[PDB]
Each structure stands twice: as structure tokens, then as C-alpha cells.
Design a protein around this ligand. Structure first.
Ligand SMILES: *[C@@H]1O[C@H](CO)[C@@H](O)[C@H](O)[C@H]1NC(C)=O
Ligand SMILES: *[C@@H]1O[C@H](CO)[C@@H](O)[C@H](O)[C@H]1NC(C)=O
Lengths: 619, 42
């Protein structure tokens, strides 16, 4: 009997009901696999464990992908934070954590609080930060962005801590880790035998921060909603000395892969991935994802070998290393297939940090995946309330774009592959990420129904996979870009009068929007008319749909200078938001020459994406 | 029918209005955008 969606959905649900996710999470907190910094013996032990599991599940093929990359680690000299009061000097902390890609340096000066280190946070301070060290709270934005924002204003170093209000942790002495590269991948290693900080940056404990605040004056504003102990600026008699001595080290990292080959179009794949490495025990950070990855591979393999599931397209499971350093393992893999990966991999599903709580279900993705997400929400229940996830029909207008710290980001913004990340979470951040308290014990105490929540995260990802691989057609919603383009043109249209003043016209941009619109309609019509059983018609149409995301990567910038080339979701002067940010200044921070080029290049990119949607040259 | 075909009449009205305006189209845009964002293809 040929299986249909209803049969597959009910089979998945059946297998999930008997799956024990918590045993696997707990096994990854055993002493043989913690802590597991990238390139460590323990990371490697876990890789080889994952490999041998994939083999046990009888995946079609299992393989290793190795890279040598340069990371930064702690030196043998301790990093330190010291109060200089001249007549006396005393140690505040030798911190147990560090920030990777810090400049190694020693600096001394005033200490100034900048809240979270957002651009607006700095703008609202009464104290200029130039020539000073800045202290900020973790959260809201990445460490890399905090450091970049501080550097932009000529700060000389950055301290980062977890305040009790946002991060209610009983232990005030807890250390933590992150990285400050404003990018992904290995920023160091040349092309023979970059978003990096030029100032030192260091994580300190809350206790350390509180000792600093005891040498500081001024209450913090109440709208910061932070602890009552917070203070704003060092006293005139005191300065802070920060010493960072981190060193570079070459490591070998292993990405572990397994595939279930498609029955019809094995050369096209959905890729499902999870970070394996972590500073410290990494239960929520890496354990949960890796457990999901293992259980999904096992279940899908069983569905194919025992239950008659015949996926049309391939399913790849990827266990990545050096995720903690900026998706380094995944980025290195992407970079090997510059310009061609999008012809093979048609979607990426990230599993990292999929279970951080119970209250909310959040999703970030390429618009191409929005219909798939919507249909999946209609068919998965919330693991505590029992209600289906689809309770807001206007959800798609609220989604936030993927960020630089999410492993799905480079797949979309660098490689042009539609990608999705999702989680069950709270409003508050999970407090133990990047610490030695990120353990199975803490995770099960905070989420005692962890097994049912993991089951729901598995069901989401499992349903994505089935939808993407089952039918002869691709469930990718290219028409979703009509709303994204129109929304942009709406934002641009606020500056119509500026545009007239400069002697320019939007006619060709309008016209390119209209061309893309009609071109998506025609492609939809063609799918509607195609003989669904003709493997040759369908492979041609599906090949076309797989190039839609890639054609929003600007062809006018080097991926070595600006890796995130996607004009909607990427970063730099070629993006559509950057065009609007410049034009916003014209009311001489505004650059008219840049704007002219930006309008031209955007228009060419959108028009070229419309043309690319036509089948043959004579159409 | 897909969303682009369902909403085609509104796309045409916007283009017709842009064409007039080049010899404010905010409503014609708002209408299209509304139709696109409230359309569920599946
Ligand atoms: C910050 O810049 C101002 C203005 O140029 C300068 O006078 C001051 O010395 C600088 N502050 C420090 C602490 O370097
Ligand atoms: C304005 O942009 C153009 C083109 O990118 C560039 O050559 C020029 O340096 C920019 N001018 C300023 C003042 O930044």
C-alpha cells in the first residue's frame, strides 16, 4: 500500500509516543562527553558515538567531514580584572570563562555602564565612553554586536556580566563563555599555508560586577529594570584594569553526517542539523539538539526500513562542531560548496536550543518555509496545554528574522538555502547557557515534562521533513516574497519626495516588483497544470523552485568581503534595509552616490530574480 | 489558485495607479498587502 500524508503523520506520532528523549540527554551529560569544547578529546568521543549510532540505525551512508580551524582559548596566564585606587591595587576576579576572539591586551581606565550595549543604550548615556572600559549586561544582542558598538565609540575594553534580574541564578560567582566575532566561520585562517574585535572583552561573574559597582557612582535608570546594586561610572579616584591573554590554537573538528537516500530524487536533500560542542556541559545548548538529531535519524530510518516510508528526496542528518565559536563547522561545510550547494540542498532545519521552556512556541525562517510552518502548527499540539500550535492566523507578519548566532543564519544568508529554527521557550532567556550549570539536572528541574516537550520539538521537525520529502512537489512558498517586496516598496515610498529631489524615479523598481509578482503566478499555474506522475516535468519545476532563495543573494558583492549576501536577510550595504537606513539620513551623514548605486543594484537583483523564474528563454 | 492569482486584481490596480502617478497609491498598496497577508494558499 502506497502511504499518504495521513498515514505518515500517524506513524510518526506513534513512534514519538514511545520515544525516550531524556535518557539520551542524560547520556550526553555523562563524564565521557562533558565538558566538550570544540576539537577536544570529549567532543571527538561524542562525534564517534554519534557516528556509530548512525551506523546502528542503518542510514544509507554515514561519513565524516573534517576541518582544521583556528579558535581562541585561554592562555596559561590568567585573565584578570583589577581595581586601581596607585597607592593600592587589588584583584577583583580571575574569571573562569572568557570571550573567544577578544583582542589580547591590557587596558586601564574609567568603567562606564552601557546597559545591554545596544546603539540606543550608548546614545542615552550621559558619560562619553571614549577611552573608557564599558560594562554591559548579557542579553538582547550578541556579544559581537556589543563589542562592535563599544568600539565604534572608541571604548578601550568591554566587560560582560549576568545581572540577577534578567538571569536569576543563585550562584553569584558563576563564570560564562561566549564569542565576539561579528560573523560565522573561521575568521583567521588564510587561503594559503573580518568582524574581529580590536579591544579586549571579558566575561565576569555577578559577584565581580557587584564589587565593581561598589567602586562606582550614580544609580542606573529604573527603565533598565536591573538590580538595585547596579551603578553607572567609576568614582574619580578609581580605575579598572582589564588583562586578557587568550591565545589562538589550531584544532581538528569533525562534522558527522548521515543520509537516508531519496527514492526518486536522491540528489536533492533536506538537511537537519545540531551543534555538538559546548564550553562546559552544554545540556540545553548542545545536548537537546544532539538528542533530537539522534532520535529523528533513528525514527526515520525505522520508518523507511520497516514501515514503508519512501521519501522522494534525501534526508541528511548533520552533527556540527565549533558551533559555540560562531557556527564554524557548519560554515566551513557551506564554504566548500560556494555557488552550488543550493542546487542540492533545498532546506535546512536547525535543532539547536529547541527546548528552553514551555510557555511559547517561536519560529524564525525564510518566508519560503512559512506555509510549511503554518500547516505543521495546525497538526502539532502544545506539550502542556494540548491546544494545536496554530492559534494566530496573522503569525507570519510577526516573525523575527534569523540572527547571526543561529546556525540557520548562514545557510540562508550566505548559501541561499531556505532555513528554519524553532523552540519551545519562555519570555526570559535560559539562564545557564554558556555556563557550567547547563546540566541535565538543571534542565529537568526547570522543565519536569522535558520528555513531552522534546517529543513536540521532534514532531515539528519530523513533520517538516515528511512534508518536504514525501510528495513529487516541493512545499516551498516562493509567492511569500511578493509580500516581502511589497513591504519594502512601502517603506521606500515614504521617501518619494527625497527621490524626486535627487532626479530619480522608482519606475524600474516598481516594474521589477510587478515582474516578480506575475512570474510567481505563472510558476504556480505551471505546477497546477503539470502531470504529477511525469518524473521529468516535476524535476524541472522543482529545480526551478530550488533556485528562488539563491537569486536574492546579491551577485554584486564578494562573499569574502560580505559573506551575508542575501538582500533581505543578510548584512551590509547591499541589503534592502541598508538602502532604507542610508535614505533615512537625508533628513551629510547621507551618501547620495551610495544611494544611487544601492537603488540600481537592488533593482537589477529583483529584476534578475523575476527573469530567473521564467522557464525557457522563449517564455 | 495561489495567492498571487487571488490578489491579481489588486496588483493590477496598483500598477495602473503607479502609471497615472508618473505623469500617491498608498491605498492601492495597502489593499494588495492586506490581500496577500490574509491569503492562505493551503
Ligand atoms: C574623549 O574624547 C574627548 C573629546 O575629543 C577628549 O577630550 C577626552 O580626553 C576623551 N576621553 C578619554 C577618557 O580619553
Ligand atoms: C559615498 O559612497 C561612495 C560609493 O560607495 C564612496 O565612494 C564614497 O567614499 C562615500 N562617501 C563618503 C563620504 O563616505
Amino acid at each position: 500500500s502506497r502511504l499518504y500524508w495521513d498515514d505518515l503523520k500517524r506513524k510518526l506520532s506513534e513512534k514519538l509516543d514511545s520515544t525516550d528523549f531524556t535518557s539520551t540527554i542524560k547520556l550526553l551529560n555523562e563524564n565521557s562527553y562533558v565538558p566538550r569544547e570544540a576539537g577536544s578529546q570529549k567532543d571527538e568521543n561524542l562525534a564517534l558515538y554519534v557516528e556509530n549510532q548512525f551506523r546502528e540505525f542503518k542510514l544509507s551512508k554515514v561519513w565524516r567531514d573534517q576541518h582544521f580551524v583556528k579558535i581562541q582559548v585561554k592562555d596559561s596566564a590568567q585573565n584578570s580584572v583589577i581595581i586601581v585606587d596607585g597607592r593600592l591595587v587589588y584583584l577583583v576576579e580571575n574569571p573562569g570563562g572568557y570571550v573567544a576572539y577578544s583582542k589580547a591586551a591590557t587596558v586601564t581606565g574609567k568603567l562606564v555602564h552601557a546597559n545591554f550595549g545596544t546603539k540606543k543604550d550608548f546614545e542615552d548615556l550621559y558619560t562619553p565612553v571614549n577611552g573608557s572600559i564599558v560594562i554591559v549586561r548579557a542579553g538582547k544582542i550578541t556579544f559581537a554586536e556589543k563589542v562592535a558598538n563599544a568600539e565604534s565609540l572608541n571604548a578601550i575594553g568591554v566587560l560582560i556580566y549576568m545581572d540577577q534580574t534578567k538571569f536569576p541564578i543563585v550562584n553569584a560567582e558563576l563564570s560564562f563563555f561566549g564569542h565576539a566575532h561579528l560573523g560565522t566561520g573561521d575568521p583567521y585562517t588564510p587561503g594559503f599555508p573580518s568582524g574581529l574585535p580590536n579591544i579586549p572583552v571579558q566575561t565576569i561573574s555577578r559577584a565581580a560586577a557587584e564589587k565593581l559597582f561598589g567602586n562606582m557612582e550614580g544609580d542606573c535608570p529604573s527603565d533598565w529594570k536591573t538590580d538595585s546594586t547596579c551603578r553607572m561610572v567609576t568614582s574619580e579616584s578609581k580605575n579598572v584594569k582589564l588583562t586578557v591573554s587568550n591565545v589562538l590554537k589550531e584544532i581538528k573538528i569533525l562534522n558527522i553526517f548521515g543520509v537516508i537516500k531519496g527514492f526518486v530524487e536522491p540528489d536533492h536533500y533536506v538537511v537537519v542539523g545540531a551543534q555538538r560542542d559546548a564550553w562546559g556541559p552544554g545540556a540545553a545548548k548542545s545536548g537537546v539538539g544532539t538528542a533530537l538529531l539522534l532520535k529523528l535519524a533513528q525514527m526515520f530510518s525505522d520508518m523507511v526500513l520497516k514501515d514503508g516510508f519512501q521519501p522522494s528526496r534525501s534526508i541528511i542528518f548533520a552533527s556540527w562542531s565549533a558551533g559555540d565559536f560562531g557556527s564554524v563547522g557548519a560554515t566551513e561545510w557551506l564554504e566548500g560548496y560556494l555557488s552550488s550547494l543550493h542546487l542540492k540542498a533545498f532546506t535546512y532545519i536547525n535543532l539547536d536550543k529547541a527546548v528552553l521552556g514551555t510557555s511559547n512556541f517561536k519560529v524564525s525562517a525564510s518566508p519560503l518555509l512559512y506555509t510549511l510552518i503554518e500547516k505543521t502548527m495546525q497538526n502539532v499540539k502544545h506539550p502542556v496545554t494540548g491546544q494545536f500550535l496554530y492559534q494566530d492566523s496573522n503569525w507570519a507578519s510577526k516573525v523575527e528574522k534569523l540572527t547571526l548566532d543561529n546556525a540557520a543564519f548562514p545557510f540562508l544568508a550566505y548559501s541561499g538555502i531556505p532555513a528554519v529554527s524553532f523552540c519551545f521557550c519562555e519570555d526570559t532567556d535560559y539562564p545557564y547557557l554558556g555556563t557550567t550549570m547547563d546540566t541535565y539536572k538543571e534542565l529537568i528541574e526547570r522543565i519536569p515534562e522535558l520528555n513531552k516537550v522534546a517529543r513536540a520539538a521532534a514532531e515539528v521537525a519530523g513533520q517538516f521533513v515528511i512534508k518536504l520529502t514525501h510528495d513529487v512537489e516541493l512545499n516551498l512558498d516562493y509567492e511569500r516574497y511578493n509580500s516581502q517586496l511589497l513591504s519594502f516598496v512601502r517603506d521606500l515610498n515614504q521617501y518619494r519626495a527625497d527621490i524626486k529631489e535627487m532626479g530619480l524615479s522608482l519606475q524600474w523598481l516598481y516594474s521589477a516588483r510587478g515582474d516578480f509578482f506575475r512570474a510567481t503566478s505563472r510558476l504556480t499555474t505551471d505546477f497546477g497544470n503539470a502531470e504529477k506522475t511525469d518524473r521529468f516535468v516535476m524535476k524541472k519545476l522543482n529545480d526551478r523552485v530550488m533556485r528562488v532563495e539563491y537569486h536574492f543573494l546579491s551577485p554584486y558583492v564578494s562573499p569574502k568581503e560580505s559573506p551575508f549576501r542575501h538582500v533581505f536577510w543578510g548584512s551590509g550595504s547591499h541589503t534592502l534595509p541598508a538602502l532604507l537606513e542610508n535614505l533615512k539620513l537625508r533628513k551629510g551623514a547621507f551618501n547620495e552616490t551610495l544611494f544611487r548605486n544601492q537603488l540600481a543594484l537592488a533593482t537589477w537583483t529583483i529584476q534578475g530574480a523575476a527573469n530567473a523564474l521564467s522557464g525557457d528563454v522563449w517564455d | 489558485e495561489g495567492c498571487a492569482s487571488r490578489c491579481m486584481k489588486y496588483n493590477d490596480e496598483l500598477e495602473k495607479c503607479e502609471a497615472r502617478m508618473m505623469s500617491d497609491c498608498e491605498q492601492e498598496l495597502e489593499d494588495l498587502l492586506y490581500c496577500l497577508d490574509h491569503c492562505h494558499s493551503q
